[PDB]
Every structure is written in C-alpha cells, then in structure tokens.
DNA sequence: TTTTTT
C-alpha cells in the first residue's frame, strides 16, 4: 500500500513511502494565516527519484539523519511546479529496517512532476 | 493544532 517517489502524484489526501533521509534541518517557526506554527525541512528520496519532506509541528526537526524510514499517509502539494511531501497528523514516521535501503549517495535526484495536458 | 517557499 506503498507507492514510490517516481510515482508520486500531487494533490493526494494520502501518500504512504519509504525512503531515506538526504538531508535534515533544525525545526523553526512559520507564520501563516491561521497563525504561528512550527516546521522544518528535510531531503528525502528512494532509488526511484527524491522528493523534498516537510515535517509540521512535532515532526519538526524531530526526524533523524540518513537512515531508513517510512513516510505515512500524509498529502502532496505542488509548489512553484514541483510536486511536494509533508508530515502532519495522519502521518506516522518511524524507522524502517529493510534488505538495505539504497545509500543517500545512490539514490537519484529526479523530482516528479504530474503529466499536463 | 496540513500550512509551508521556491
């Protein structure tokens, strides 16, 4: 029930994947229309491309470094064209041990991008 | 306490 990030679509309600972590920043504080919140960033991605995660509230700067983990049902949102990942409450990120997850160094770059007409 | 920024 896990897709992957070279087949990720944006404007989805749901997105469950596992992948490792590229990068990862200390949380901070936003401000938005309904207030104050606090996030952080972190590059993720799988052998099947790379997508950037957005971590919200508690999530924020509270995931670790490279290391295998498992993106939950979360959403997509497409910002200035490029499609997007987030972690909020349905989400549930946790530690994941495979057959070995494909290094950092070894997992692509390619962002997804729905086709349009 | 789903909003973020290029």
């Known amino acids: 029930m896990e897709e992957k ?3 990720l679509k944006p404007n989805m309600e749901s997105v469950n994947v596992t992948v490792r972590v590229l990068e990862a920043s200390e949380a901070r504080q936003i401000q938005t229309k309904n207030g104050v919140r606090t996030i952080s960033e972190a590059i993720v991605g799988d052998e099947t491309g790379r997508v950037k995660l957005t971590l919200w509230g508690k999530h924020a700067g509270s995931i670790k470094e490279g290391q295998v983990v498992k993106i939950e049902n979360a959403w997509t949102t ?20 495979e057959d070995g997850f494909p290094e ?6 390619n962002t997804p991008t729905a086709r349009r007409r």
């Open 5 to 7: 990030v070279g087949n």
């Open 78 to 97: 497409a910002f200035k064209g490029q499609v997007q990942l987030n972690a909020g409450s349905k989400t549930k990120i946790a530690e994941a041990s």
């Open 104 to 109: 950092s160094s070894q997992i692509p770059e």
